[PDB]
Amino acid sequence: SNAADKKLVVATDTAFVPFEFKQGDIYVGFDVDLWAAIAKELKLDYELKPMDFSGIIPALQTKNVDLALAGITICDERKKAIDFSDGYYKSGLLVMVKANNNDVKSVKDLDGKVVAVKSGTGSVDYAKANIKTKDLRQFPNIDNAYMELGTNRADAVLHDTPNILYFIKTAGNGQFKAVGDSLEAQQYGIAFPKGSDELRDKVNGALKTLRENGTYNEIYKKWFGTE
């Protein structure tokens, strides 16, 4: 076998649930599983390099890294320094309601209710504008906003569709459902250095295949649950 080993350098954020987080002395998450599955098909060898989002692109610029799979969302401004592949996840804001809440079904059914959000999120603006709330409970951590819904001190919560789902699944055990569809949708994608080009198209085809194959659904169930 000698040293024909692929020097592919992969990079992720130190802490970022539920995509790349440390659990059981091993980084775990959706993005890790995705790159593992892609590799199987592409038959390439990877070496995850953990760093702060601050240096992810800066590094890709000098190609100190050859690929990066964090929560990089497709953005044309950034394309001046890097290049993205077809997205692997639909981002956006979702609405959690107690499962027994069969009255609310969407964000427009919230006019005149209590919606819990987190400070420094995009949930605030959408609500400050597209929504007519009798009260906006801006908490500094969603965990507490989840309590409010659990104590029916709020009618529903508004936060990233990924997060709301992980919890509906992890420590959800009912009394928590999702309604409607992801608002302000975006797409998450792998980021390849400008120099790399075929490696990109190769990975693009790989993702088309795995989504064509559809094992993504099972991985989706493991993290974000049933679509």
User: Which one of the spans 16-24, 47-55, 152-160, 196-204 is the region binding Na ion (CB under 5 A)?
Assistant: 152-160
User: Closest approach of Cβ 175 to Na ion, in Å?
Assistant: 7
Token reading at 76: 């044309």
x/- binding map, residues 37-56, to Na ion, per CB under 5 A?
--------------------
For Na ion, the closer CB: 23 or 152? 152
Q: How far apart are CA 38 and CA 21, in angstroms?
A: 19
The Cα 38–Cα 170 span in angstroms is 26
Q: In this chain, which residue has its C-beta nearest to Na ion? A: 152
Q: What are the start-end ranges of the H helices in 2-52?
A: 30-42
Q: How far is the CB of 100 from Na ion (least distance, A)?
A: 6
CA dihedral 68, 73, 74, 75 (to 10 degrees): -110
Q: Give the separation between CA 12 and CA 32, rounded to whole angstroms.
A: 9
Cβ neighbors of 60 (< 8 A, separation 6 or more) are 11, 68, 81, 82, 191, 192, 193
Which one, 148 or 160, has the nearer CB to Na ion? 148
Nearer to Na ion, 25 or 103 (CB): 103
- Please state the closest distance from residue 109 (CB atom) to Na ion, in A: 17
Give the nearest distance from C-beta 153 to Na ion in angstroms.
11
Q: What three-state secondary structure class fits 49?
A: strand
Residue number, 14 or 102, with CB nearest to Na ion: 102
Radius of gyration of the chain (CA): 19
Determine which helix (DSSP H) or strand (DSSP E) holds 61, and give its type and residue range: helix 53-62
Q: Which of 103, 105, 85 is nearest to 95 (CA)?
A: 105
Part in contact with Na ion (CB under 5 A); list of ranges 9-17, 104-112, 145-153, 183-191: 145-153
The least distance separating Na ion from the CB of residue 138, rounded to whole angstroms, comes to 23
Closest separation between CB of residue 15 and Na ion, Å? Answer: 33
Closer to Na ion at the Cβ: 152 or 170?
Answer: 152
Phi, psi of 37 (to 5 degrees): -65, -45
Nearest distance, CB of residue 98 and Na ion, angstroms: 5
Distance CA 220, CA 204 (A): 19
How large is the angle between the packed helices 216-224 and 161-169, nearest 10 degrees?
Answer: 80
In the bound state with Na ion, the residue whose beta carbon lies nearer, of 103 and 198, is: 103
- Of 141 and 152, nearer to Na ion (C-beta) is 152
Segment interacting with Na ion (CB under 5 A) among 3-11, 132-140, 146-154, 178-186: 146-154
Q: Name the residues that contact Na ion, by CB under 5 A.
A: 152
